Design a binder for this molecule. Structure first.
Ligand SMILES: O=C1N[C@]2(C[C@@H](c3ccccc3)C2)C(=O)N1c1cncc2ccccc12
Ligand SMILES: O=C1N[C@]2(C[C@@H](c3ccccc3)C2)C(=O)N1c1cncc2ccccc12
Lengths: 304, 304
């Protein structure tokens, strides 16, 4: 029993973290096979950050200007290209520690583990969610750039996120591993609107199921509701609208607890309208939306 | 910026996790050099759990009754002994992946990372605290037994915790790596009183410092207080008494924020007396006590 914000074990990703230096700028890179991936803003100086011309900046750079270090070992760079907002440095040596891996573009409301790194050395691991407005609420300092987000399915690592930017508002923006930003963000030091973040309704409901499984049941009420009636309340409280897809993926948790999805929706409605009244659910005084139904089932079934 | 419940990277510990089978019972073991450590209750059957005689049970066991598997590879057991509540199985092969490590008995209120394992394979990593009543509020299912807690200082792993028991109340009890229980617990399937848990006051104050550093300042008030006056309020609200040692270790955070410890104590007092009023601090509606002053400084300075 018990329920924790649990990260994937980070071993397979630690063996891929390197340091990339271009002039004075150092940040983290990801070494898979004979390619190192990193944020392209590694080629920027103090002078460039308001509006860098990345093509023009890259053109003044050669293979030997990119210093790639894995622990003590220096790597030899034999090719470089820019794909959207990432640099791909071809090195002469395949990473011996390369795990089975894919690159995935995740959807808003999905979760992943972040290995926070500095100078190509791992500092910490935590779990987080792509917010509906495509930001992440991470823990990143100067030099964390190029730190990666991932999921693990058995032996296969799915890299989904590369950290690029802290926004003036203190939240975090980055790319998939093909260098496309999540959300409207660009790699320029400007004020950029993230926009209105909503709560991930399907995730709150998954967490209510997690609570019931672990013995917190006080919020279960006598009521039910409809998908329409519920969504009218969701909208008022800046909750993502709930669809039949959401109801469908909550099926396993519905089956395990014997609580219909719409009965759980009716409990949520009363929590939104009446608050928690100073009570707690799974040691929290607010509604948690950073567990997917998958995460709850995994943690409640012990997938390894 | 941002502030997360961050775990240590788990790579160095993943390479040490093995499966130990004795008869029908399987749980996790820790393979360091040519010794495997695991909970001694691996030698118990359905018949034994109310009051096992571990000496008598062990005496009916030989080296070849202990099946130790690291992934596919079977290990050969060439010696066995019982040290308090752990079994030490000597195997013929030194773990090639053994990191630099120590065994440490941590103190209540200290934090560590848990690698939750099943059948000797790692499932997840999270951060948690030794509660003042020597329990931990983990996330453990059947077969998680022998999962370990640790800290990392540079390249050195300090193993502090081995998981043995879920208590009838849903909280978790285990040993140091010399097999001594934290708290009054025994490895018998009986109702065992954990007793009154308090809040770790020094940790709440560290987290208030973390909040101020990250821009949440609303709880800063015009007041100050005394260590005596504060402790009178602490006692009322089941908070650990604050000592000059606590005040001393908060010095670096005091220096970074320019807020005196006793001014922060006066803010805490008003939060305890008046509650949060529906407001939040670092995305939480309750006072968090699972960050040490060390953890806050580490996360706010980027130790790698
Ligand atoms: O270290 C940098 N540098 C940039 C500034 C930004 C940038 C954009 C265009 C051209 C050059 C640089 C990339 C940044 O946003 N961070 C941080 C990342 N995460 C967390 C941070 C926390 C504090 C300060 C900077 C951070
Ligand atoms: O799998 C076991 N087995 C014991 C029962 C307990 C025991 C004590 C004496 C002799 C034999 C066995 C050790 C346990 O407490 N757990 C669990 C651990 N963590 C989390 C658990 C969650 C659900 C069920 C059991 C759990």
């Amino acid at each position: 029993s018990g329920f924790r914000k649990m990260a994937f074990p980070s071993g397979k990703v630690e063996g891929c973290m390197v340091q990339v230096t271009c002039g004075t700028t150092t940040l983290n890179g990801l070494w898979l096979d004979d390619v190192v991936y990193c944020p392209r803003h590694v080629i920027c100086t103090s002078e460039d950050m308001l509006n860098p011309n990345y093509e023009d900046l890259l053109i003044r750079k050669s293979n030997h200007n990119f210093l790639v270090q894995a622990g003590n070992v220096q790597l030899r760079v034999i090719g470089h290209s820019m794909q959207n907002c990432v640099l791909k440095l071809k090195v002469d040596t395949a990473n011996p520690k390369t795990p089975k891996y894919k690159f995935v573009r995740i959807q808003p409301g999905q979760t992943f583990s972040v290995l926070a790194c500095y100078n190509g050395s791992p500092s910490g691991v935590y779990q987080c969610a792509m917010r509906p407005n495509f930001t992440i609420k991470g823990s990143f300092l100067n030099g964390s750039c190029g730190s990666v987000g991932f999921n693990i399915d058995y032996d296969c690592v799915s890299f989904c996120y590369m950290h690029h930017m802290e926004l003036p508002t203190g939240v975090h923006a980055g790319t998939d591993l093909e260098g496309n930003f999540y959300g409207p963000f660009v790699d320029r030091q400007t004020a950029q609107a993230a926009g209105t973040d909503t709560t991930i309704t399907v995730n709150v409901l998954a967490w209510l199921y997690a609570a019931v499984i672990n013995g917190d049941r006080w919020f279960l009420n006598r009521f039910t509701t409809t998908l329409n009636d519920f969504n009218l309340v969701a909208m008022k409280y800046n909750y993502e609208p709930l669809t039949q897809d959401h109801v469908d993926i909550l099926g396993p948790l519905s089956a395990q607890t014997g609580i219909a999805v719409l009965d759980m929706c009716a409990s949520l409605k009363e929590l939104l309208q009446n608050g928690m009244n100073g009570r707690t659910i799974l040691g929290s005084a607010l509604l948690e939306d950073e567990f997917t139904p998958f995460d709850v089932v995994r943690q409640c079934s012990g997938v390894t």
